[PDB]
Amino acid sequence: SLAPEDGSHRPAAEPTPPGAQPTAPGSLKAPDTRNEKLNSLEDVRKGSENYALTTNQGVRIADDQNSLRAGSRGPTLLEDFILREKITHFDHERIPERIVHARGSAAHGYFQPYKSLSDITKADFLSDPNKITPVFVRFSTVQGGAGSADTVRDIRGFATKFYTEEGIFDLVGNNTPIFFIQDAHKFPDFVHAVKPEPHWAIPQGQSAHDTFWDYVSLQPETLHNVMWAMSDRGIPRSYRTMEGFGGHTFRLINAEGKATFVRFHWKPLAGKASLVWDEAQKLTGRDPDFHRRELWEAIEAGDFPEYELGFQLIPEEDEFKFDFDLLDPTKLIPEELVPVQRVGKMVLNRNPDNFFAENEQAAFHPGHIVPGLDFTNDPLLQGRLFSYTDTQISRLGGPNFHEIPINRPTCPYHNFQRDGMHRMGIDTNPANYEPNSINDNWPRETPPGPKRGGFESYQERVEGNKVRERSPSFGEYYSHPRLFWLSQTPFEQRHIVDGFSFELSKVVRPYIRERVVDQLAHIDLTLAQAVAKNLGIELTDDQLNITPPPDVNGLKKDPSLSLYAIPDGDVKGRVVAILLNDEVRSADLLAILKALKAKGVHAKLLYSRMGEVTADDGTVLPIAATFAGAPSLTVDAVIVPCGNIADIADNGDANYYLMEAYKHLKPIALAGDARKFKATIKIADQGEEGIVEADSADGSFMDELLTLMAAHRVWSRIPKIDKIPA
Amino acid sequence: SLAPEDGSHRPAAEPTPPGAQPTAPGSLKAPDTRNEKLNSLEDVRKGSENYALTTNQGVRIADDQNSLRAGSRGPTLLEDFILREKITHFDHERIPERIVHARGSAAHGYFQPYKSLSDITKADFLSDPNKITPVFVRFSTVQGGAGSADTVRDIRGFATKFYTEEGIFDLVGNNTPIFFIQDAHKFPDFVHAVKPEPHWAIPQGQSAHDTFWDYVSLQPETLHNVMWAMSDRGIPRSYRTMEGFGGHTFRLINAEGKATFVRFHWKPLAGKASLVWDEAQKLTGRDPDFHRRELWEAIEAGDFPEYELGFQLIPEEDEFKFDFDLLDPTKLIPEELVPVQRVGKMVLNRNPDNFFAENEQAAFHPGHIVPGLDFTNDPLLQGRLFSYTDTQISRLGGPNFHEIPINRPTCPYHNFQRDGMHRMGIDTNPANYEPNSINDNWPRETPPGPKRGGFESYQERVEGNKVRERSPSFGEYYSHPRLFWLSQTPFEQRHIVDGFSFELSKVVRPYIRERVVDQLAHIDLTLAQAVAKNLGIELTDDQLNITPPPDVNGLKKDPSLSLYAIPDGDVKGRVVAILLNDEVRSADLLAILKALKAKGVHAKLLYSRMGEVTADDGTVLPIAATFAGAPSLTVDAVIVPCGNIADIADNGDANYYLMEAYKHLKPIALAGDARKFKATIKIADQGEEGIVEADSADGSFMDELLTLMAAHRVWSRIPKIDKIPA
Numbered sequence A, B: 001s002l003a004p005e006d007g008s009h010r011p012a013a014e015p016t017p018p019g020a021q022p023t024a025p026g027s028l029k030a031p032d033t034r035n036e037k038l039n040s041l042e043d044v045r046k047g048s049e050n051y052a053l054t055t056n057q058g059v060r061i062a063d064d065q066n067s068l069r070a071g072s073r074g075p076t077l078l079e080d081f082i083l084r085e086k087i088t089h090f091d092h093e094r095i096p097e098r099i100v101h102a103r104g105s106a107a108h109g110y111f112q113p114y115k116s117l118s119d120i121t122k123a124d125f126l127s128d129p130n131k132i133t134p135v136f137v138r139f140s141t142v143q144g145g146a147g148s149a150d151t152v153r154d155i156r157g158f159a160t161k162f163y164t165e166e167g168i169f170d171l172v173g174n175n176t177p178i179f180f181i182q183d184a185h186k187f188p189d190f191v192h193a194v195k196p197e198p199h200w201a202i203p204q205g206q207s208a209h210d211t212f213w214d215y216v217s218l219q220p221e222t223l224h225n226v227m228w229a230m231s232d233r234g235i236p237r238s239y240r241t242m243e244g245f246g247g248h249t250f251r252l253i254n255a256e257g258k259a260t261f262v263r264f265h266w267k268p269l270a271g272k273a274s275l276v277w278d279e280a281q282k283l284t285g286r287d288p289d290f291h292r293r294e295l296w297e298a299i300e301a302g303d304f305p306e307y308e309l310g311f312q313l314i315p316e317e318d319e320f321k322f323d324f325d326l327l328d329p330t331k332l333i334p335e336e337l338v339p340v341q342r343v344g345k346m347v348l349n350r351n352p353d354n355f356f357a358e359n360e361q362a363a364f365h366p367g368h369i370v371p372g373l374d375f376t377n378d379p380l381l382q383g384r385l386f387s388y389t390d391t392q393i394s395r396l397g398g399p400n401f402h403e404i405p406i407n408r409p410t411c412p413y414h415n416f417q418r419d420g421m422h423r424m425g426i427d428t429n430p431a432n433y434e435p436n437s438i439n440d441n442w443p444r445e446t447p448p449g450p451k452r453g454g455f456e457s458y459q460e461r462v463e464g465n466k467v468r469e470r471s472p473s474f475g476e477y478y479s480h481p482r483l484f485w486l487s488q489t490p491f492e493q494r495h496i497v498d499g500f501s502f503e504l505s506k507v508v509r510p511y512i513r514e515r516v517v518d519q520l521a522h523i524d525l526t527l528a529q530a531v532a533k534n535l536g537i538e539l540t541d542d543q544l545n546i547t548p549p550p551d552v553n554g555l556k557k558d559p560s561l562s563l564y565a566i567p568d569g570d571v572k573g574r575v576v577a578i579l580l581n582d583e584v585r586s587a588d589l590l591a592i593l594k595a596l597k598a599k600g601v602h603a604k605l606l607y608s609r610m611g612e613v614t615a616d617d618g619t620v621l622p623i624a625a626t627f628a629g630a631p632s633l634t635v636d637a638v639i640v641p642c643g644n645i646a647d648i649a650d651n652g653d654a655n656y657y658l659m660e661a662y663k664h665l666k667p668i669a670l671a672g673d674a675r676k677f678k679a680t681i682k683i684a685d686q687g688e689e690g691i692v693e694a695d696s697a698d699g700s701f702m703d704e705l706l707t708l709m710a711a712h713r714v715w716s717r718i719p720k721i722d723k724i725p726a
């Protein structure tokens, strides 16, 4: 026995806040969180306690410390099959990572509609509010490898596998409502331009390099998604606080065969929230697993990620009613024109047991649809349907990837397909072909119908010549970027400016920066001028004179495009650093933690060393991390309670803690003598909005703090931060 | 016709300093650099200028912007083979990364021995000082994925492929002289313990988590290499400024049949230099590609990485003359007892053309030896021999990985092996077996001999029973960690204490921190008490009385174990930040640059925006990066010239640049009114060692600054940094 006497090696199997317990495989953490998919995985879950260590062939190992050798200082013998099996498995552990979205973090959960959608779709999983569909959701970045950092500036993926009674439906979306390019044929070109450059494989997790900006400068269709990426959309605070979108127009098909154009949305019930660039970038170094950690910890704490599924619905007769093409995936559908109808809720409530087996091996593919859904001619979606099947043949080693446990349907699957590498299913059917008489033609085709019917494509009319040609209706590149720009708040606009400015400064060939600045002048002159000024570029007369693109169907903005214009901040699951001293006023701390608890806000108690400190009244306070070990980057606000403030007053790390949080626009609260830290961040005696201060941490001081936290960041502080050396 | 008219898209094909030009593929950057291996790759190099865009079957493509569809808004057609070939290739770009050492950066070079070593080895590549051997060297971290960050704390790999006239020899070493474990059977245990934990795949690039320290606390044999990893050896400044070691005892075999034991060494001719922890961590965020970029840029500049091959040589009859077992890979051979004999020089002087083709596909394996070398019974080496062949079968797709161009021998290779996936060689031999008469038994066996002879193993005596048993002579864990500790300077000991303290503070289960502290108590009490204090742990009276381990063969220390005890700095290839203002005194700048050029030191000119500023006298100064864009982390020293200081005096970023460099112990030089910045880093009027100051940059402001850079960092500043909030 190697475990400690007191059992402190094993985390409690009950929900606990971030950092109170060691994290654990989801079935050991939350053994009674069940869904039909989790239950069906029980046939392959393997335990460990009380079992003998064995080879893979079931032979018990006596000595797992030593190779077999001739003499105890002799050569290793070829007949050591225990060593070789163990080393062979190790030698072959890795499989190819995903071509794109290789970095991702996943969890199990469930979906339930708010109401029957049978009027617009025959999809069985939307037929009844009491129908619960298990899901497995993987969130991801796009550019970086599986080992890259989470808080990069990038698009994020948001892929949901629905295990429905009528097939797996995979909704494979991103956190912006469009993509960079129009036609799938260009996907390898765009992806090669953004990925590490081929001679030296730099940079990882970054669009901030010559080839990306070269491609963008030569392909103005990219400008819309580039605006999204350069805004704070590209740096979410958490996968829980970002939107999701299918990107493409798909179709719903009802029992009568009527088709309705649909775009899919996921609305985060924790609201929208993003980092600021300096904080995100520094966070890639301080914790490159920050989002992966934050997701896994939210679920272990019972702060389940929740999203509302939304449909923007457009009748078939309305295909041509907008001044952009519905099938152009570089164009969004403003919610002011077509509202998002809220259709159901998805809740992510259990982490995987084994990351490699369930997350790394999961296969999501937008061609995985079910009766009641169909495709459109969107030329980016069309070519996707080829790729997500093809790519699995090397990534997951052959065509039986659907037999990998996480990928298996929970509903029946039977057909005449046979063999392939690592074939699991042993078919007993005398027939492997149809039509057959020898098994009475089973399994049999099923006619399309209102429920449990076979899949039939919507009989869309196709008229034209075989051509490699972009639709003329796709040839407008500037008006959606502008609509997005005009819908941002002024501080969101300034961060977009800073995102282009920072990125372009890392482009080595100056003519690329100039060409990009030209494209910005086609979108908005104020934007183009602001970025030009940060690059030392002067706009020419021609450029000052470029007529702005037209409004989108008469819209001069749509506030649903902003992260922050319409407040939807939720503090549950956020985190505050509390900076301790060696004699904390226990009364400040009691009230603080009580008020945070009431709102579901977590706390990490921080000090200049590990172990514990003792409060004025003798309460022993355990330390979660040092100031340097858990930087302000990792929290949403900072409180400094009263006590022996002299203990920390001269600590560089504790002062810097506050400077960093201040620079990144986080709320700061200072009680009693903690107000002496106002000097480090240059706050006037009379105080400032976003700095909470009081003689003690009374009820009012906490309400003020928690109000600021609901608004996420103190945007009004931005003009004070450039004087601050941090 | 998309290139700019002025040709500025194309990097100058001649040596230029970091940042002056875009980087490029080696064969375009340095077309005149050659060696035998680079010449032999010529048949697979593919050009591009003036060629048509084609399919892989050579069919010219007319439209590479669109898929083939029925009507320009219609569905994509299955008959578009140009689209499917291009997506198919993209879909299968990725191959499995290396189980360990997945993150690495590589270059071509050559090796030449100083003199014939024929008296001690018949290895052809060591036989003649005129004999030049091409090499390809890949440096790496160990734990993180291929997309993880460079400046992590980790062991580093240093692998060299020698393309000799008698076979490929791979010398597959690391940057410390030992390993964590004794027997290869445990390799998957240790590697699993250090790698991201299996439920959630966290943390990347870091040993700072519970499973690593649980294994260490249960396996004291690990403590030697842990000491190294926790010292500044764990965070080198550059692959150019670290040592390399083969780790194991191997044999040399001369023409007479005499065996001599040998341990391999690489000495960096640029000297030994490491980062400090806070700087290394933050740098994984600001530039996760910093070592890869630095290596590529040094070679493009002509600062070729150079290393001296050295041997520690022990006669067979001295096998048992030490306090430790020569075969135990957790033990080092102190240079005090067995000096390193210099053998030859290696220069890395060309970057690859394609990172994937040459770096990612390169296969190094220490079983690749040549006649004149042989193995020993080291039980970690012994097991390695199995792994590096086996692992290539999945990583590189089959047994023909030696035909991938980078892996090919430059010397003849002929045998009776056939077939296998992606077989390139087309064999014309009528025979595929021997003995044969039908091809007169060719290719033929060759007897061993003084040169050009067949491989024969040295006839070592083996005697004992078939056992899975550790040699008792390996059962001593603490003496080498202690010898390591006592050989370090007091500031190096401080950094070791801080590395244990930081990592252990991230271990969630406290009993594990306590168990590790109990292990440090067996090594050295001062070390153990200093880590304990940082962790709030108190040593027991029993722990305080642990007798220290014996010295190693009479040694109370060995200064060759310290990075810094014996100065060996070299400033060539280092970089200085120069913080500009809008009216720079140009006499200061001429003097600065002239002095830096004279020592081969680079400079990057930084401002608050990109573009240019104009000096007092109309000299236009191009700006390389912004203060935020190229942080102090990325440079070795900072110089602030005189001019309009009021321009930058209240710029937060400019002040913080100096505070960050100050904290990280970098030399800082201030001229004239730039002395105003002394207030931000809290320097007294009369000055301090490590801050160079004067009315103007002369003559001997530059000699002082450069003397400080030669010493690398200002260690004496350490007591001052805790105060500073940065």
Ligand code: HDD
Binding pocket: A098, A099, A100, A101, A104, A138, A139, A140, A156, A157, A158, A159, A172, A173, A174, A178, A179, A183, A184, A187, A246, A247, A248, A329, A362, A363, A364, A380, A383, A384, A387, A388, A389, A391, A392, B087, B091
């Ligand atoms: C034809 C090329 C192509 C096209 C144009 C796109 N994708 Fe894709 N995508 C792939 C080809 C691909 C892929 C190579 O097939 C991936 C990588 C590995 C895999 O399993 O699928 C993938 C992965 C992938 C993932 C990760 C799924 C996972 O977590 O495993 C997401 C979320 C998206 N894609 C989303 C999108 C969106 C929203 C797109 C446009 C609206 C888009 N992709 C266009």
Ligand code: HDD
Binding pocket: A087, A091, B098, B099, B100, B101, B104, B138, B139, B140, B156, B157, B158, B159, B172, B173, B174, B178, B179, B183, B184, B187, B246, B247, B248, B329, B362, B363, B364, B380, B381, B383, B384, B385, B387, B388, B389, B391, B392
């Ligand atoms: C028995 C397993 C085993 C053991 C005990 C070791 N290695 Fe290893 N090593 C492997 C099994 C392995 C490997 C799985 O075979 C790798 C990864 C994939 C590859 O091509 O080789 C590898 C890669 C690898 C690399 C990277 C090569 C490259 O750049 O591609 C280096 C530098 C080392 N190792 C160095 C060492 C050192 C100095 C060791 C002890 C002194 C050591 N390894 C012990």
